[PDB]
């Protein structure tokens, strides 16, 4: 008589309903975002737009798999889609996370170049190409999400009729080292998806804030307004991504650290039960972006 | 890394209250999931009581209700009590520990590879008719 | 009177290999076709451009689902993707067929307008718009292929531990009317996908040839050459579609009519075993088109 | 409108050979697939020999080799030669016809629908010792 092993209240079909609504809203909004970005003349296209485009693509590559996951939750964690589709859906989840955070990092670096250092910003724009940066970020996201594609599978664990899409470590690990592989993969994913990109983003934002405070007595009003527009929408996107993907990574890393510090079973069960909601909010991030574009950037509203 | 040792071997006539215990080292509640299986003499290994995430506890049909199962994470000890013993219950009880999937999967205990997790040494339970 | 039931060998992996090759070639070529159509000057977008774009879209939608059918055939007719993907893939197959034949019918009608009745061609261009025609044809294709989506399902037929993706007329009929429903659906599909559209095509081509016979002694040489080029590519597309989808429809109709004519056992078995190759040939059309554009249409070669 | 009529299946001691047959009506090779099932008293009905598009004709384990199923499309008849009987062969046999899937599916016989298909009246094959 240690503790319970159940899965708390069923919560009804709230998670599948949110997944379906987020699928619809994200598909519509990200299609509109791509349309607005690529309908403007190439001569009147800023650099940041390309990153925005990738963001939309990332969301558009995940929201389409959201209905499947919704079905997964409706049938009490049953996967009637095949090992290949479990792999592809989870791979697209991780690709969305990595690509979104890399696009935010690139946007913050672009703002850093424009704000703190304009001459070398022009120099780097001459050197660094936006298309090359987008290709590099997408290739890196794909290569980083490859382990999810490799190690996912389907199986009727616990002998119930349901089939579960789970990450199997029996291929690359022994009976014991399975926890080591899981903790390593989770910590590396959390690092390169939240921690490192956000420390680059926070250093960039600290320098931008310092330079803005210094130049509040200087600089040009019109350029100040334009940079305020772009920095505001970019900061809103970054903060929304932080609030939407921080619970997920936090609970994941708390589970990993409780594998070591030996948290009481009550806390581990609590983490197990709250994690679906963190997953849900992380998915909701994939549709929250177009509405942010439609309220802080009047350019998207008019077009 | 994770090893288990059982106890409770004995002979009790029908209708007994025989308890069995299994230990564990280097295994936690968030990393492993355990249960008790039976192997009848000359027959295959049959599950008895597996502690599972989906149903909490999964009991074998032929013995359902007449027995209890519990765990203690403080000392990593699993317990299984056979009440109202029957002559057919004479078999080779084992305690099995299989890895538990992460929170991403849903912490479902990976019983599908019961033949790959750490298995107990074995405990013979004999019941007189 | 032996009445064998089994098929001829297994064709090895030839059908899955052709499916994968058509998947790659169709994706690449149809993406290039859409890019070429939508990249040139919008003022120079002829009426054939929208129909070519719809053809490419239908081919792309079908070749996307082609790898699923390749896997299905590879594993001795086992469907691991669930009922939803069975329905979606079969529905996309029929949507591709209907949309392709409708787009070719529209191309032939446009040639009839611009070659036989230029004044009535201008009048209809003033009245009928390309976007409306494309929307009507796509909606009609979707509605006509909806029965396949409704009735197709997955079932472990025959107790071979292989789930098969088959049309289930059990819901819409009893046992005594299953054959009637199957024959009606198949004949209606064959009619609206290959007989009425090709009757319209042949009437248009007959009148085009009748006018061109007189035009051989008159008319401007340059306009005649432009009409020759566009009519040549469109006629090549129509003839390729005919040769690709004629085995499928012919074998299907022969099998359906065999019940009415009480055809022998051997002929029914021969049609049964020859049908997969007819299906493969029909699928090849989804990738044959871009090569036809390359060899005939000068615009595609330039791009 | 597919209809079935049984025949044969009398009383023969063990090790004999019963010639058993089922007629047909309104069923063609391109539309329906036939099979012989048996139901034994005290237990559940089982499949004996099914005309099967895949894997050829399919047999049950207890009837491998000893039985043989043939079909004539011209006369629309299905046969069975229960040679070398066993004392456990006493049961009531039925001939069942199931719709055949379309040529698009692969013309596989819809045996999962065997309950909804047309079933013969059946005959009490009384195999003695
Ligand atoms: C004026 C011109 C240049 C604008 C061109 C706009 C193009 C690039 C935009 C407009 C609409 C967009 C599509 C809208 C919706 C979807 C569905 C999604 O699941 C994949 C992307 C896809 C298919 C988009 C691709 C890019 C797209 C075709
Ligand atoms: C549940 C199991 C049995 C399903 C197995 C499906 C496998 C064999 C199929 C389904 C979809 C297929 C993929 C579809 C698309 C691509 C991208 C292309 O650039 C290379 C081939 C590749 C990578 C295919 C490889 C084979 C593939 C993964
Ligand atoms: C100067 C301006 C007007 C040029 C506009 C070019 C636009 C319309 C072109 C250029 C790139 C093209 C895309 C390139 C690749 C793909 C992926 C393919 O699977 C479907 C077609 C699609 C989605 C194309 C659609 C049309 C497209 C978006
Ligand atoms: C094998 C079985 C159990 C799988 C069940 C899958 C079902 C429940 C899921 C899978 C994909 C889903 C569809 C995905 C996309 C769309 C298009 C949208 O415009 C309406 C909803 C609709 C049509 C969804 C309805 C529900 C759906 C069909």
Author numbering:
A (entry chain D), C (entry chain C): 17 to 319
B (entry chain B), D (entry chain A): 1 to 129
What do the study's own words say?
The apelin receptor (APJR) emerges as a promising drug target for cardiovascular health and muscle regeneration. APJR has been extensively studied as a drug target for heart failure and cardiovascular diseases, with two endogenous peptide ligands: apelin and elabela (ELA)9–12. The formation of the APJR homodimer occurs through a small, hydrophobic interface at the junction of transmembrane helix III (TM3) and extracellular loop 1 (ECL1), facilitated by the “FGTFF motif” (human APJR residues 97-101).
To investigate how the antagonist recognizes APJR and its potential influence on APJR dimerization in the absence of Gi proteins, and to unveil the antibody binding mode which could be beneficial to guide new class of therapeutics development, we utilized a functional single-domain antibody (sdAb) antagonist, JN241, for cryo-EM analysis. Subsequent cryo-EM analysis of the APJR-JN241-Fc complex (JN241-APJR) revealed a predominant presence of dimeric species, resulting in a density map at a global nominal resolution of 3.0 Å. Moreover, the antagonistic antibody binds to both protomers, inducing a more compact dimerization. Upon antagonist binding, the side-chain of E174ECL2 from APJR reoriented to form hydrogen bonds with residues T52/R53 from CDR2 and residue C109 from CDR3 in JN241, indicating the importance of these interactions in JN241 binding. The structure also highlighted the significant role of all three CDR loops of JN241 in binding to the extracellular side of APJR26. Upon comparing our cryo-EM structure with the crystal structure, we observed that APJR adopts a similarly inactive conformation. Delving further into the dimer interface, we noted that the interface map density accommodates the five amino acids of the FGTFF motif with high clarity in the cryo-EM map. Compared to the FGTFF motif in the crystal structure, we detected subtle conformational shifts in the side chains of three pivotal phenylalanine residues. Intriguingly, in the presence of the antagonist and absence of Gi proteins, nearly no monomers were detected in the 2D classification. Comparing the structures of agonist-bound dimers with the antagonist-bound counterpart, we first made intriguing observations of cholesterol molecules at the dimer interface, potentially contributing to dimer stabilization.
